[PDB]
Design a protein around this ligand. Structure first.
Ligand SMILES: [Mg+2]
Ligand SMILES: [Mg+2]
Ligand SMILES: [Mg+2]
Lengths: 83, 185, 222, 141
RNA sequence: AAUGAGUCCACUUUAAAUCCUUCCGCGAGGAUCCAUUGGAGGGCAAGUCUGGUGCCAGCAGCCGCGGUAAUUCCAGCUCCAA
RNA sequence: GAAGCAUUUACUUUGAAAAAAUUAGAGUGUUCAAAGCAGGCCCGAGCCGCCUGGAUACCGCAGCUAGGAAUAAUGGAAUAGGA
RNA sequence: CGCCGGGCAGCUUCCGGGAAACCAAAGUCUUUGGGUUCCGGGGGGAGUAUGGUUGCAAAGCUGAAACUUAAAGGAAUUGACGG
């Protein structure tokens, strides 16, 4: 990508895992992308927005997708920070 | 003991695999479409291109602003431009790496004679050269593989002695005319 | 006439998603070949690498089946390689073509150096393994062509890679393994991570939620 | 594993030549027993004199009589057996003729179903065997 | 219509010649002024065409071919490679 | 600037010296090329001749030379016979 | 009932590897370099002949070549057969 003239020479830009920062390939059918709903501060109703996490198949096969999603949710202000 | 030189080299290389269908088809297309004699002429042209590409690769691996890179790259680019296989706008070694042997085969004298309208049908252009009808600027050339430079391009013409430029018609026309006038009054 | 039974096939047939790259981007499984010849129609070429007559022994002699190796692809960055075995050859070739369409993958291309024009070679050196076969693809300058055996040459020409040094190891007379190893290296082009891909990704909506209203009205079930 | 030390060139080189003696081709080329054993003595062809015409039975599963000659070489006068290749070429060779003899293709190895024959006849007395077979020339009579 | 390859006068060449080069005069219609070596099962481009032979004669680097319908021998024809 | 280096080496960079030919490579229409080292420009003619080349690189290890000083080896005060 | 260290092992695992059987080492290997010793190079002939050397002997150690051959092997699969 980015030949010297400046344009982008790529079919597409693949996703990176949000836990291990690895490329999620086009034939990785164990890799999820999950949106987590946000709520407003006053009444806790779903306000139409969400935060998105992608996990590659290797992390999700290690058994570490649970802790990774929990840490990402800590980092994004989802639920507790003191759980 | 002797004042000889003995310095010589081959000008071609044979392909590694004989009887490859795709390669056979491609070089037959080149032979038929450019009117060559054998596979050896195709191999000679692609050997020439391969040596140019080897020089260009070795210069490209060197550092920019190296004096040797500047000197030999400029000389190589000037040479390829003066024989017309590379344009003046494309004056970098990458465009040297973009060349193909259909660019070199176009610069032969046979191809130029056919494409200048000076002879139809590239096979007729070969036999016209080999029978000494054609001259670059004033020199009579019978070499179908003469590589025509850009400067000596406007000066391809019939030679002054052939019966397509000046006079003196050939032995067949002279023979037919003299037997006709011997048979007539 | 194509009547799809898949959410992805329903979205593809109704022109809701175009340009197969986002199907790759969200890494979804393609389970209908009609999607592939919908997007890459009139550019896919297929060729038979090998027909091998496999056999198993029964008490009334051998039962001979036929295995077909078909490589497919447009010459601009997609290949697949399918393999099917059948009692007769034409059925095996048909099934191998369908399987090759289903297993199609995008090919990343790069520059040898001085990134001037279109990308022409592999972006780095990649290696695929299958059985004992190890195939190594190496970036080559422009006009080099493909320096390979005929089988990875066929696969790499269908990938749209113009210039590639190669290297092999193992029993390469096991053409199935050797084709599969070339296909493996080709797919791990986009498996690979390069400094120009370090930029943080931005998550767009998956096609399953972008058109969930279309899918609830038209796909299920009516 | 192998030693990788910066000052280990002697160990590496000595090991390599000691282990180079362990392949068949290097030992065959560099020992001199093979050069002494073969009748040509490193030459590509040799001249000899036919002692008798023999037929060797082909190895199984083939079944034929391969027409050979028994030849005694002029230098170092060993006795070899040479094939006479083509459909009728044995009738050209008469007893006590003087042939040229070449290798038979596999560098001192037997070829085909012919058991133990490493040589073929080229040019029975000086007219070549191919020209005799093709009718180009005839025996110098 | 065009041309050499040859035959050959002269120049030139050279110590003297020869060869090339230059140039008179002759020199092509099966332009008989005649392209050959290897091959045609696979590896490996190219025939399951025909006649003969019948585990013989032979081919075949290697797998193999041949026991009276040989895609492989011996030939003709036709193709392939340089 | 005369003298010396507060260790000595390895290493690295530079500079000298490594025959020519061969190889790489610049220039040059041998009629093209393999080659060669040659050539090119005006003559309306005195022109009682003018211009230009015959480059450059590479040449292991050992030896010589001048900068660097990380890495690796090594050395100085313990019976103080120390600065 | 636990924790730490060093042991002999076991189960399980898409760590990764491997031709596979399998292996937490047989992993961290074409993305190939932590240190080092011994050792293989198609099958036979042959661990034979010969020389040397050790031993009371039996034998041990070191150790060819001529010649011969297109496979000999490994691991898995399907059948067939199994007193
Ligand atoms: Mg180790
Ligand atoms: Mg025939
Ligand atoms: Mg052995």
């Amino acid at each position: 990508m980015q030949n010297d003239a400046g344009e982008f020479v790529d079919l597409y830009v693949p996703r990176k895992c949000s836990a291990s920062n690895r490329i999620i390939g086009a034939k990785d059918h164990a890799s999820i992308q999950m949106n987590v709903a946000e709520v407003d501060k006053v009444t806790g109703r779903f306000n139409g927005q969400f935060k998105t996490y992608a996990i590659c198949g290797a992390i999700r096969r290690m058994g570490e997708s649970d802790d990774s999603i929990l840490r990402l949710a800590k980092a994004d202000g989802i639920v507790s920070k003191n759980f | 003991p002797v004042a000889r030189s003995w310095v010589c080299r081959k000008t071609y290389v044979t392909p590694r695999r004989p009887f490859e269908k795709s390669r056979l088809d491609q070089e037959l297309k080149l032979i038929g479409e450019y009117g060559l004699r054998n596979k050896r002429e195709v191999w000679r042209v692609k050997f020439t291109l391969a040596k140019i590409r080897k020089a260009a690769r070795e210069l490209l691996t060197l550092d920019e602003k190296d004096p040797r890179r500047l000197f030999e790259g400029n000389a190589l680019l000037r040479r390829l431009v003066r024989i017309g296989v590379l344009d003046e706008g494309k004056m970098k070694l990458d465009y040297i790496l973009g060349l193909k042997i259909e660019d070199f085969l176009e610069r032969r004298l046979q191809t130029q004679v056919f494409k200048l309208g000076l002879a139809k049908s590239i096979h007729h252009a070969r036999v016209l050269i080999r029978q000494r009808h054609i001259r670059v600027r004033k020199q009579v050339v019978n070499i179908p593989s003469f590589i025509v430079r850009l400067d000596s391009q406007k000066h391809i013409d019939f030679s002054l002695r052939s019966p397509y430029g000046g006079g003196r018609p050939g032995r067949v026309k002279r023979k037919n005319a003299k037997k006709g006038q011997g048979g007539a009054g | 006439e194509w009547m799809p039974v898949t959410k992805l096939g329903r979205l593809v047939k109704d022109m809701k998603i175009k340009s197969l790259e986002e199907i790759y981007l969200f890494s979804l499984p393609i389970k209908e070949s009609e999607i592939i010849d919908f997007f890459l129609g009139a550019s896919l070429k297929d060729e038979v690498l090998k027909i091998m007559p496999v056999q198993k022994q029964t008490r009334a002699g051998q039962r001979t089946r036929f295995k077909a190796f078909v490589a497919i692809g447009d010459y601009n960055g997609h290949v697949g390689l399918g393999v099917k075995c059948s009692k007769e050859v034409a059925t095996a070739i048909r099934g191998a073509i369908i399987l090759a369409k289903l297993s199609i993958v995008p090919v990343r291309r790069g520059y040898w150096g001085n990134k001037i024009g279109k990308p022409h070679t592999v972006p780095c050196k990649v290696t695929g393994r299958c059985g004992s076969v190890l195939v190594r693809l190496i970036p080559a300058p422009r006009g080099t062509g493909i320096v390979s055996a005929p089988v990875p040459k066929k696969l790499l020409m269908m990938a749209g890679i113009d210039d590639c040094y190669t290297s092999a190891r193992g029993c390469t007379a096991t053409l199935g393994n050797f084709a599969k190893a070339t296909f493996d290296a080709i797919s791990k082009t986009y498996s690979y991570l390069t400094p120009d891909l370090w930029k943080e990704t931005v998550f767009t909506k998956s096609p399953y939620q972008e058109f969930t209203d279309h899918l609830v009205k038209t796909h299920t079930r009516v | 594993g192998k030693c990788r030390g910066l000052r280990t060139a002697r160990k590496l080189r000595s090991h390599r030549r000691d282990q180079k003696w362990h392949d068949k081709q290097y030992k065959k080329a560099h020992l001199g027993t093979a050069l002494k054993a073969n009748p040509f003595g490193g030459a590509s062809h040799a001249k000899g004199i036919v002692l008798e015409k023999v037929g060797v039975e082909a190895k199984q599963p083939n079944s034929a009589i391969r027409k050979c000659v028994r030849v005694q070489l002029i230098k170092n006068g060993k006795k070899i057996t040479a094939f006479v290749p083509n459909d009728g070429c044995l009738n050209f060779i008469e007893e006590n003729d003087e042939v040229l003899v070449a290798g038979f293709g596999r560098k001192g190895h037997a070829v085909g179903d012919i058991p133990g024959v490493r040589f073929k006849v080229v040019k029975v007395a000086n007219v070549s065997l191919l020209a005799l077979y093709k009718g180009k020339k005839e025996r110098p009579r």
